[PDB]
From Swiss-Prot, chain D:
Organism whose genome encodes this protein: Thermococcus kodakarensis (strain ATCC BAA-918 / JCM 12380 / KOD1) (Pyrococcus kodakaraensis (strain KOD1))
Subunit annotation: Part of the RNA polymerase complex.
Role, per record: DNA-dependent RNA polymerase (RNAP) catalyzes the transcription of DNA into RNA using the four ribonucleoside triphosphates as substrates. Forms part of the jaw domain.
Subcellular location: Cytoplasm; Chromosome
Name assigned to this protein: DNA-directed RNA polymerase subunit Rpo1C
Top-level taxon: Archaea
Stated family: Belongs to the RNA polymerase beta' chain family.
Portion of the full sequence shown: 67 to 131 of 391
Amino acid sequence: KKVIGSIEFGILSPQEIRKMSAAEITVPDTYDDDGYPIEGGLMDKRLGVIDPGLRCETCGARAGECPGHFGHIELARPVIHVGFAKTIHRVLESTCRECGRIKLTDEEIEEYMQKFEVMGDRKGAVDKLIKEIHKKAKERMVCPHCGAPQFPIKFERPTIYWELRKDEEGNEYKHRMMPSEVRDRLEKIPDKDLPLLGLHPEKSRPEWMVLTVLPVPPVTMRPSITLESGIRAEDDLTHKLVDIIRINNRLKSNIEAGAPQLIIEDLWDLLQYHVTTYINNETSGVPPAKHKSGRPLKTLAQRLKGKEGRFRGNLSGKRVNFSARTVISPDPMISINEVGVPLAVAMELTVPEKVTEFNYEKLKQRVLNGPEKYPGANYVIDPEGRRIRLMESNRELIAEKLDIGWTVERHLEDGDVVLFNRQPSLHRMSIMAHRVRVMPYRTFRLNLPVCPPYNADFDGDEMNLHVPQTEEAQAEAKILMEVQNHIISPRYGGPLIAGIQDHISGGYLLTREGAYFTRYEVEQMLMFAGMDVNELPEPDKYENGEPLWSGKTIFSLLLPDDLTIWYRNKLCDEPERCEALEKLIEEKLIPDPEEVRKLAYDGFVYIQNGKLLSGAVDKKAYGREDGKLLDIIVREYGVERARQFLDQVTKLTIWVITHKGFTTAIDDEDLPQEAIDRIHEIIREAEEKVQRLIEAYKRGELEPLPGKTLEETLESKIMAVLAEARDNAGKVAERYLGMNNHAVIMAKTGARGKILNITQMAAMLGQQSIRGKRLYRGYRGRVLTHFKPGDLGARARGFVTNSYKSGLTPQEYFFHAMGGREGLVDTAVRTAQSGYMQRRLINALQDLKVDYDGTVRDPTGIIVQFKYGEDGVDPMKSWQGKTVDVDRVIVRTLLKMRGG
Amino acid sequence: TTGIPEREVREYLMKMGVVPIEERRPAPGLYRVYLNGVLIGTVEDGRKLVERIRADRRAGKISDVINVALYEDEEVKEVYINSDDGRVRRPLIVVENGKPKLTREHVEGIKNGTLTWSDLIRMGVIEYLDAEEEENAYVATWPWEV
Amino acid sequence: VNEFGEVVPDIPNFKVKFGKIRIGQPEFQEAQGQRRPLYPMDARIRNLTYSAPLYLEMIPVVNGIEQEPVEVRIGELPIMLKSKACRLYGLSDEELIK
Amino acid sequence: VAAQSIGEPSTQMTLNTFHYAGVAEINVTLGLPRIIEIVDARKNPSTPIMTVYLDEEHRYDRDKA
Amino acid sequence: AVSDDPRIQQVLFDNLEDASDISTQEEALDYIGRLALPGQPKEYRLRRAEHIIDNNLLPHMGVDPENRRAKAYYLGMMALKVLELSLGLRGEDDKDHYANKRLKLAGDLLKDLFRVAFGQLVKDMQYQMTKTYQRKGERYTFENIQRFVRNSIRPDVLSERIEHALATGSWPGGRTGVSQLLDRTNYMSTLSHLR
DNA sequence: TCGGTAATCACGCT
DNA sequence: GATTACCGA
Ligand SMILES: [Mg+2]
Ligand SMILES: [Zn+2]
Ligand SMILES: [Zn+2]
């Protein structure tokens, strides 16, 4: 039971390939044919088994558990390897030929020995050092030991070398260098000169870069795909290796008998070309060797790589077991940290259980019951390792004495931790361990407040769970990954798992002034929202009509008994009537909750001692962004309290929005006649200002800005007039229609709305621009062919003037499709640039931890940041960037002590 | 567009006042009649020739896939003729001196079984524009505002 | 076809000048050869290629003298449904049901 | 958790009010293409705008500034 | 040949006189033979540059060396249009405007697929005529051509190339995905795939 | 300055 | 097909 310490790389010597190999291959043949598929070449010449025939190199080795073995090819002529060839040129122009030295004096040898150990740690600093040795050996032609024997200049790109040698007097003939001429030079380098290059004398000899013996990959790495029923598609690596041996074979015969001397060198280059595609097919200056149907061959460098190769495709991202994938559909009746699981997926996924001493009465029943009835088991396991599947014809003989130590695999039950996933996995939080509950249908169910972490919606999406199994990886999932630990987020501190669309706008109808519930409706809703109180709905606060309660005190049963919070929220339309309340509170810390506090407002939330005296709940107490009433309940009253504040609020709030009605018909957008005529005087004079500003430019009354040109000043002034005009008409409609229909309640508080698209539905639609310019593309000086050319008017250059209720006329509709397609392009363009920008930053930064003494360190021990993040508070639990929050502490601690 | 033989068009325009390449200087001669990208021939007055072919097409003598565009820059003048085979066109109704041509008296004929689209393009009231001839047009939207 | 015309062989005696083309009605011969007309519902139900034969006669030029034209079929050509060349052209409503 | 909380908010980078109502600062490539230009070094960067602040003698004088 | 406008014309005297006293007449045809390959080709020098100009410069005018008189005027006219743009006399022609964007469709594409497959059948005809003259020599005179013509064709070479390029949608020019199977759900969507 | 070449461009699913 | 930047005279 060892572990991998270190992996050390190098180059295979041709000596070492012979000892590794079991056979030499000389026959370009696969089967030949349809019986006895055994040959003397590339297939199983004691090389590797992929079929169900047991013949191997004497070692049994059926096709399951048979590692392949390596073969070799005795290449008759030496051949330059492709990947090293860029660095062979660095060796050749930095050595003195015919002797083997380094073209340096002993002075620079003795100086630059010492510089290796000083910069003996970092990679980037020693890589820059090896260029200057390459620099100084380049600019010499006179060596200190051979008297300058006319050094030639090498040349490259891609594989063919040359020399600039003189023959008669000053000749410059380019003798092409042969691989046999190169490798004779490389063997003359002594081993001591190798630290002065980037080489190592025991792991990387330079003469081993020239391939004299090419190794053959095994059969198990080159499978044989069967096409229909008996036709075998040959593998792409296999197909090229067959064609390599046929260009070798003749060459052996060619130089042993043939003597024309010309085709030999011509054949020589075919060998080079043919193995060069085999290493890396997509090199430059090389035509791709195609398959004889129209596909290029994916050779070794494309099997290792290529965006779906074998670092991301199969090694660091793998396909898994024990998962499922279906659609999602809401239910607000389960808790925040549970999940629905269908009973079809629940009966095809299993955990192992390992009966010890105290669950032995349980797992006798789970294995006696078969794999049919829902408490059941599938696979039992003895301590030897021979599993016994249960399905077949008896379970009684396995439901005997179960013999403590066994491991039974049973179905998922109510309580076993699962995970969950969304797949685009953007941030830290889109995987979170839930707590399985099993219900019959075909959808994953999911509680509504847990859907800002997943960033999902319910228009047919797909979420995948995957069970963890071993007992160490399962108790890690429950403690570190449950939902309630993730109620606040590490990006901004504020709560993330919080209320959504109905949970906000239901809470406004509960805390309005005038929300008086009768006796049956108070008593019915306290049973539905979880809570357990005894006979105290008391005391019937306003008996003026009938004995019925108020709306504040039904909300003041959910809060703990010693809260004290006061803040102002989004509904504040009169800032003066808040002032009075604020002033009194700050001077008389605890007044009486009866007398003075019934001078209250509907936009100043004030709770003391778990009793909401004055306020109105909107999206400042919940919400996907900051709500400071779920925020101040996780830092003061544990976590497990705040999972049942959010579990009782949610079911209380959807009750009142159900049995009070919240329709929104067509009359919510309707304006009476005199309010419509207020709009038309804005649109007329704003068009008149445009028609005047065209005449100022056309007769030479330019009034220019210094920076911009006359056309760019004109467009500036025009657009401002048009912009302002649409906001001035938006204020007229907004002032008019009251805050008492169910279309502005959704917009002031905030649950899927703005106050823009409710005045973009009974007013203008503004202009219609495209990345800052107004619409200009089209014919020669006129956008549509309904306008006289040479026109810069408002109505004629992209400006609609009718609502989404009063009908768009056909120039306005085609102007509106132009502005709509600019929005849809920027979804699919911007998503692909942000996705690649994330992969850069994760893969550069995933190394950094925090040590026990507060230090962030890289894997090499280089200190990155002392005393983590300007020491030392976690941003997940800090308040708004800052630290210990003295201000809140003072008020909170004093209140409890003084109040008593 | 479907297609038509090109060589018949060369003979038909040459007798209508096209002064060929044998004589042309050309510049600055108020010239440059093209034909499917090829420059052939020259005519003197731009406004005379581009109106002349359109009046013959809306009579029925020449074939129905011919369309003339004019370019009227302050210093440059081109007369374009297009007779290739892969353009995209669009139907409009000819108006003339303020009155929409072929009002109701033909429209009950379309409602009856007398005539059809094969007869209206021969009778000269429907016109298929390119993108290039459509530069010279100025199109209304409703029969109210004409 | 009239782009190519005469090119080669190497013998000075035989030459080939290209003639005209006709396209027959859509028919199909199986093994144990027998030619029957196709009907496009039959060609999407047993994996055929609804096609038409391409007949092209050639002119043998023997030393200048032209004497005998033979029509040889060159290959097949797929054919578009409800075109002028297929069997559905101008065919009335009560017959497409048939 | 540093690389994920900086790569989540750039995916919700939809359109904004590209018709900003200012005059002085002009065309400084707001949005997601700035974030790539600051992360990747890129010696060139498009639209350089250097803010210049003034001392105690060219502070309040309109025409001398 | 280019123009007679004097403001265009003075630009041409700058481009002439700066390089006219480097290369004289009829030697830039030889200079392409200097460019395409070196080391005194002589027989490859003159002859390859004759093959480059007559088969790459504007093949829609002709392929004969007679036709060079027309190609000199056509390419002379495009150099006009570059040089009033340096001064500024027209505007840029936009390549989205439907005056210049045509649609090659199933009539025009299928002629391109027939051209390649029929041109390869002629080359297959010549292989079976030259490799039959000697193997059997002389036969019955008028029944020679009744068996030289009909046996030297082997018809199946044409039709597979027609089908297989359109049953995959990868045409030998380089086009991919020109034959996509007809999406058949809900009648509004078979019709929208035909448009 | 100045020209040149590679090497790079979401998630899942059919 | 577009951005860069590193490499090469
Ligand atoms: Mg969705
Ligand atoms: Zn083995
Ligand atoms: Zn030496």
